[PDB]
């Protein structure tokens, strides 16, 4: 109730985690242009067409590495660095990220998108669309919308 709330409080804590993630993974690779090399391997690794870009149950976010992770590089480091396809989600997490601020401390957020290598264009809404900034109940209403069996989100985060 009353605004996103987590967009100011929870965000400050989330930033630390992800900014440490991109730092850690980078320190192990040393740029590699943009973790290049993993692409060719991982792409054909899973069915040649990585179905992991989406979960069929309700739990996959491409970003973290706390559970079932799949490593992959993006197009160009500056635009997008890396993506890790982690299966894991919850209805609360859907609202949590939409009540966060995924814009200043994110590279992009896309719900029901598949193809982390080259994410779709970013607007400001969710579901079969990606957005540049995530915030306010408006996003929350759009992110958690018909998303049950189709509840999966690839998202690059800084």
Swiss-Prot record:
Disruption phenotype: Deletion mutants cause significantly less diarrhea in volonteers. Disulfide bonds join 94-144. Coiled coil: none annotated. One of its GO terms (cellular component) is pilus. It is found in: Fimbrium; Membrane. Keywords: Disulfide bond, Fimbrium, Membrane, Methylation, Plasmid, Transmembrane, Transmembrane helix. It is a single-pass membrane protein. Its main location: other. Major component of type IV bundle-forming pili (BFP) that plays a role in adherence to host cells and virulence. 10 to 100 laterally aligned filaments or bundle-forming pili coalesce into rope-like bundles. These form linkages between the bacteria within the enteropathogenic E.coli (EPEC) microcolonies that are attached to epithelial cells. Belongs to the N-Me-Phe pilin family. This is Major structural subunit of bundle-forming pilus. It comes from Escherichia coli O127:H6 (strain E2348/69 / EPEC). The chain holds residues 38 to 193 of 193 of the full protein.
């Amino acid at each position: 109730m009353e605004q996103s709330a987590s967009d100011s409080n929870k965000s400050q804590n989330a930033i630390s985690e992800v900014m440490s993630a991109t730092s850690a993974i980078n320190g192990l690779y040393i740029g590699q242009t943009s973790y290049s090399g993993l692409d060719s391997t991982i792409l054909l690794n899973t069915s040649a067409i990585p179905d992991n870009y989406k979960d069929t149950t309700n739990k996959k976010i491409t970003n973290p590495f706390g559970g079932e992770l799949n490593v992959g590089p993006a197009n160009n480091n500056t635009a997008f660095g890396y993506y890790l396809t982690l299966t894991r989600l919850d209805k609360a997490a859907c609202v949590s990220l939409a009540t966060l601020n995924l814009g200043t401390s994110a590279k992009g957020y896309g719900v029901n998108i598949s193809g982390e290598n080259n994410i779709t264009s970013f607007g400001n809404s969710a579901d079969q669309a990606a957005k540049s900034t995530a915030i306010t109940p408006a996003e929350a209403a759009t992110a958690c919308k018909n998303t049950d069996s189709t509840n999966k989100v690839t998202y690059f985060m800084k």
